Amino acid sequence: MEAAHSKSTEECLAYFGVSETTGLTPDQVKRHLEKYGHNELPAEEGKSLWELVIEQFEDLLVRILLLAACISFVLAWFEEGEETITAFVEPFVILLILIANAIVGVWQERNAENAIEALKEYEPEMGKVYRADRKSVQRIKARDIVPGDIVEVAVGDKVPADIRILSIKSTTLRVDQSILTGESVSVIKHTEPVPDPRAVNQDKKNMLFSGTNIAAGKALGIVATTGVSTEIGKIRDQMAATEQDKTPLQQKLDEFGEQLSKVISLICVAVWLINIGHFNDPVHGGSWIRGAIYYFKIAVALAVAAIPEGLPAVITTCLALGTRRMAKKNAIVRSLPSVETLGCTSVICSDKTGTLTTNQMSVCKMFIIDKVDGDFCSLNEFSITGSTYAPEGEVLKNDKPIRSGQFDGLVELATICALCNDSSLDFNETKGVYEKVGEATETALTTLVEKMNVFNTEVRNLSKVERANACNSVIRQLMKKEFTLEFSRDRKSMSVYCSPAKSSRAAVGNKMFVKGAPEGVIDRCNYVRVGTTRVPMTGPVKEKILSVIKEWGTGRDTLRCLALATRDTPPKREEMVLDDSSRFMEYETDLTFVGVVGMLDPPRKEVMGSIQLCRDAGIRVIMITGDNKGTAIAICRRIGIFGENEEVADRAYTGREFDDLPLAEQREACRRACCFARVEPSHKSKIVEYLQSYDEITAMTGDGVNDAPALKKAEIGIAMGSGTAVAKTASEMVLADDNFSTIVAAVEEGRAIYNNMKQFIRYLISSNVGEVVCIFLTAALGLPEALIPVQLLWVNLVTDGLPATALGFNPPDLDIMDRPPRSPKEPLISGWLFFRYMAIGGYVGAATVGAAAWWFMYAEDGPGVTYHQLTHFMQCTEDHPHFEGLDCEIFEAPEPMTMALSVLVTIEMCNALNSLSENQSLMRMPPWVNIWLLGSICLSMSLHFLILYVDPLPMIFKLKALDLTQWLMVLKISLPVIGLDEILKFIARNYLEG
Numbered sequence: 001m002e003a004a005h006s007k008s009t010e011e012c013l014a015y016f017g018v019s020e021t022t023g024l025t026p027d028q029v030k031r032h033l034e035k036y037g038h039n040e041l042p043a044e045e046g047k048s049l050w051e052l053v054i055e056q057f058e059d060l061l062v063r064i065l066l067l068a069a070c071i072s073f074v075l076a077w078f079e080e081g082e083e084t085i086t087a088f089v090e091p092f093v094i095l096l097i098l099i100a101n102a103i104v105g106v107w108q109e110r111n112a113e114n115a116i117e118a119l120k121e122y123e124p125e126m127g128k129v130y131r132a133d134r135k136s137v138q139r140i141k142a143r144d145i146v147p148g149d150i151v152e153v154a155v156g157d158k159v160p161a162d163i164r165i166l167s168i169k170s171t172t173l174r175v176d177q178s179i180l181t182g183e184s185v186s187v188i189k190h191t192e193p194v195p196d197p198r199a200v201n202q203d204k205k206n207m208l209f210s211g212t213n214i215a216a217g218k219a220l221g222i223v224a225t226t227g228v229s230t231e232i233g234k235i236r237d238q239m240a241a242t243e244q245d246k247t248p249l250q251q252k253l254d255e256f257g258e259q260l261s262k263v264i265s266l267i268c269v270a271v272w273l274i275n276i277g278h279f280n281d282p283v284h285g286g287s288w289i290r291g292a293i294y295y296f297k298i299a300v301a302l303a304v305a306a307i308p309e310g311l312p313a314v315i316t317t318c319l320a321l322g323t324r325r326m327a328k329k330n331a332i333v334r335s336l337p338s339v340e341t342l343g344c345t346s347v348i349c350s351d352k353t354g355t356l357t358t359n360q361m362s363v364c365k366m367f368i369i370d371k372v373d374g375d376f377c378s379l380n381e382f383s384i385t386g387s388t389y390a391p392e393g394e395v396l397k398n399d400k401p402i403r404s405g406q407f408d409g410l411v412e413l414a415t416i417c418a419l420c421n422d423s424s425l426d427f428n429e430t431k432g433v434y435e436k437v438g439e440a441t442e443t444a445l446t447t448l449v450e451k452m453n454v455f456n457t458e459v460r461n462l463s464k465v466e467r468a469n470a471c472n473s474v475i476r477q478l479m480k481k482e483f484t485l486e487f488s489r490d491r492k493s494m495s496v497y498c499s500p501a502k503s504s505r506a507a508v509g510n511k512m513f514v515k516g517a518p519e520g521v522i523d524r525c526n527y528v529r530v531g532t533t534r535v536p537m538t539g540p541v542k543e544k545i546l547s548v549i550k551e552w553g554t555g556r557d558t559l560r561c562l563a564l565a566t567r568d569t570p571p572k573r574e575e576m577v578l579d580d581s582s583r584f585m586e587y588e589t590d591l592t593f594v595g596v597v598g599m600l601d602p603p604r605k606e607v608m609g610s611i612q613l614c615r616d617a618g619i620r621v622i623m624i625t626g627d628n629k630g631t632a633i634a635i636c637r638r639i640g641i642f643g644e645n646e647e648v649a650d651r652a653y654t655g656r657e658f659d660d661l662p663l664a665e666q667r668e669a670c671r672r673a674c675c676f677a678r679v680e681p682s683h684k685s686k687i688v689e690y691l692q693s694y695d696e697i698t699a700m701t702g703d704g705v706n707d708a709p710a711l712k713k714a715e716i717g718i719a720m721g722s723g724t725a726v727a728k729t730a731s732e733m734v735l736a737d738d739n740f741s742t743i744v745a746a747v748e749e750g751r752a753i754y755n756n757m758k759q760f761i762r763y764l765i766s767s768n769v770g771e772v773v774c775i776f777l778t779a780a781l782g783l784p785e786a787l788i789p790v791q792l793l794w795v796n797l798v799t800d801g802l803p804a805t806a807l808g809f810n811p812p813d814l815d816i817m818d819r820p821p822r823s824p825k826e827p828l829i830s831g832w833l834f835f836r837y838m839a840i841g842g843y844v845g846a847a848t849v850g851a852a853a854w855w856f857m858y859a860e861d862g863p864g865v866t867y868h869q870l871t872h873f874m875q876c877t878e879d880h881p882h883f884e885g886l887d888c889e890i891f892e893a894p895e896p897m898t899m900a901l902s903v904l905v906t907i908e909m910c911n912a913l914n915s916l917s918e919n920q921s922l923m924r925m926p927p928w929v930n931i932w933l934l935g936s937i938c939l940s941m942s943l944h945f946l947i948l949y950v951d952p953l954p955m956i957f958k959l960k961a962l963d964l965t966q967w968l969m970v971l972k973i974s975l976p977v978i979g980l981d982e983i984l985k986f987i988a989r990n991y992l993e994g
């Protein structure tokens with residue numbers, strides 16, 4: 001029955017034809033279950049173990065590589081017994097690596113869900129209903145609840161389903177809807193209809209929403225909706241309906257598919273130059289039945305010599321490394337790519353109630369009278385530290401710790417706070433934290449009392465559980481609580497009637513301790529307490545009291561104030577009627593004012609500092625909350641989003657004010673304003689979307705259901721460890737610690753990972769250029785193959801492997817943060833780096849066939865072949881007489897290729913040291929700035945000597961150990977590449993912007 005809120009109680013009962021006194025009959029339940037299904041969200045947690053792998057391979061580059069594998073498959077398939085002892089190994093290698101990444105990534109996803117399953121479904125969901133079945137209330141599975149059911153809820157209960165309040169058993173009912181509405185202070189409900197059919201959740205004051213919890217009171221109601229029809233249900237679907245388009249860095253890799261797919265065409269161009277050369281000569285000794293087995297062979301030859309086949313692993317490795325580091329800070333990163341992505345973020349949108357704030361009401365300011373003398377009235381003002389329910393903090397006066405017990409006024413203040421209170425505080429040994437019991441604004445008084453410790457009770461040797469009520473317990477022993485006059489909306493105050501307890505003070509008599517909205521309570525005070533004595537309430541005294549209440553009620557503070565007083569000579573129980581709250585106000589008159597306490601939903605400790613760091617990092621921080629604007633702004637001032645006295649005319653908007661703006665203005669407003677309050681969940685999503693329309697990598701931070709859609713739409717969703725399950729599933733990262741500053745650390749790391757990431761891409765690909773420049777020089781130009789496929793593979797893969805991951809330990813500069821986030825569209829590899837790795841790329845060419853072929857021509861132990869009899873080596877087993885040498889097989893000798901490979905390797909080791917800095921000379925930025933890199937080169941080099949000695953290896957890799965004379969030639973051929981780049985860099989720093 002949607003719209004139940006607009007209908008009356010009888011209407012809702014009639015609608016389902018159920019008795020309010022007995023509940024549904026077991027026959028109706030069976031029928032309603034049939035017509036409405038069970039109470040519950042559509043079992044979540046999609047994407048199976050299979051789904052993951054599926055999309056894993058759906059990467060452009062893995063695809064390119066895998067496709068390569070199909071083409072190379074027919075090549076290794078079309079190869080005769082010449083070097084096919086391991087030439088067909090290739091496909092297995094590639095394929096293995098493929099599954100090698102599918103396995104890892106998928107591993108991380110499942111893993112994630114696990115850390116993300118932190119006590120969250122550990123506790124079974126129950127619901128209390130009355131059914132014709134029996135007279136007593138029944139505790140059943142919440143999933144078995146159906147619309148029409150009669151439900152009962154009480155303090156501490158989690159509302160099982162969307163319910164229409166029928167009858168309130170307590171004087172009043174209070175609900176904390178923060179987990180859904182972001183509403184700071186609990187909402188007091190009523191049973192009358194809410195006419196406006198368009199009333200938002202904050203207006204449905206006669207409804208209880210599934211997922212929320214009862215702050216105070218007891219009530220009976222009728223279930224309106226369940227499953228996906230509930231407010232929380234709607235949001236889950238809304239959220240699910242939002243699309244996750246793509247990934248910020250993944251997009252970069254999707255983008256590198258360009259540089260390679262493009263070579264696909266580039267090779268076609270180089271090849272086109274020889275194909276036509278044969279459509280001129282009349283030969284019929286093998287058409288499309290025989291002759292052609294060479295044309296398609298080189299296409300993959302250079303292909304694989306094109307794809308820097310390490311990189312997908314290297315990326316996973318370094319990235320994952322960043323993951324772990326984040327984790328050392330309690331940074332659960334549910335996804336590997338966002339790791340770096342949070343770095344690129346230009347904007348951080350953060351929720352209020354539950355994320356930027358702790359969500360626990362806390363008393364921090366208070367005052368009693370100091371002295372009264374005529375028109376003079378001075379107050380004793382104190383401040384209180386601590387921003388949670390924990391009994392940890394201090395009372396200060398003029399910023400210095402004092403002993404509250406030395407102020408008689410505070411002893412009575414603490415006493416009123418402890419006695420005039422229907423709630424308490426507790427320690428959840430399971431969650432390991434303190435929790436309120438009953439109303440937040442009352443628990444705040446409880447913990448205040450535990451901090452004050454006015455009787456200096458011993459608390460150092462106590463357990464967390466005992467510490468929670470130590471001081472309060474002491475005070476509860478001084479007076480017997482006869483009864484309490486519960487809070488009423490007209491009077492706006494609460495009081496308790498107490499009689500003397502311990503015989504220590506029996507000459508005291510009965511007392512009434514009162515608290516409530518300042519104006520009404522102070523107006524009912526005829527006296528003011530000063531220490532232990534009392535003076536009459538005078539205009540000058542009242543003025544001073546009200547002026548400080550006023551200050552605390554707005555401006556920098558904007559605290560919720562409560563006035564505390566006591567009735568020294570209360571009526572006799574007999575002369576008091578306690579069944580009608582309409583009489584209470586009169587009993588709470590002729591009172592003695594004692595003091596005032598100021599409280600509010602505190603910002604988390606580290607938020608202010610965090611927002612300042614982001615500022616310096618050029619990252620904006622925008623508050624987007626469902627709470628009222630007054631509170632939104634107040635918290636913005638406390639954390640620094642707004643100046644203490646700044647005017648926020650057009651920098652803070654309500655949901656409505658925002659909507660009253662033309663789309664264009666709305667969009668613009670997201671770039672200017674930093675506080676959006678009283679907004680709906682779609683509002684949050686909308687704001688993020690606007691930000692993204694300016695090509696800004698945006699992050700969202702939340703805890704409640706109303707954050708879920710925005711969290712998902714943001715490039716990086718960040719959920720509070722103590723937040724809802726929804727918010728977490730919709731996030732890439734979870735602050736298990738609730739430490740807001742971890743976000744900044746994540747940005748910092750997400751940044752270091754990155755830079756060093758484009759790095760191992762530089763150095764790595766280097767080989768492919770040098771690699772095909774040689775194949776092209778020997779195919780369409782001359783000399784035999786200087787290097788082969790299953791030769792260059794071990795290079796790219798292991799030879800260049802450890803060094804890359806090595807770049808993961810690459811030391812970030814000490815100024816990586818104190819600088820703005822990089823361009824959204826910025827390419828990556830280009831301009832002066834394309835040429836930087838192209839030049840170096842094409843150098844290795846003149847170094848391979850060069851220092852290698854060198855063996856063929858001038859190598860003291862090589863043939864001594866002439867230049868073009870080498871560029872025509874193909875015509876050896878026929879036009880032999882033209883160049884009568886010795887054995888037409890020396891052209892397929894391992895020595896030349898080994899000479900070439902060894903040059904590739906040595907050159908890459910050096911370029912590893914170079915790629916250290918984009919434009920910094922190796923003299924300015926020494927190669928020992930990265931110890932891992934030095935060790936990786938050692939490891940790669942010794943792995944080279946391994947492939948050249950251990951019999952099995954040199955056999956399957958078409959090589960042969962070079963001579964010291966040949967190595968020295970390799971060095972003279974390779975080393976100078978450092979000189980070339982050491983020069984190109986210089987030209988970049990001096991005569992260029994570098």
Ligand code: BEF
Pocket residue numbers: 181182183351352353354624625626627704706
């Ligand atoms: F809960 Be958030 F402040 F919207």
Ligand SMILES: [Mg+2]
Pocket residue numbers: 178181182351352353354355702703704707
């Ligand atoms: Mg919230």
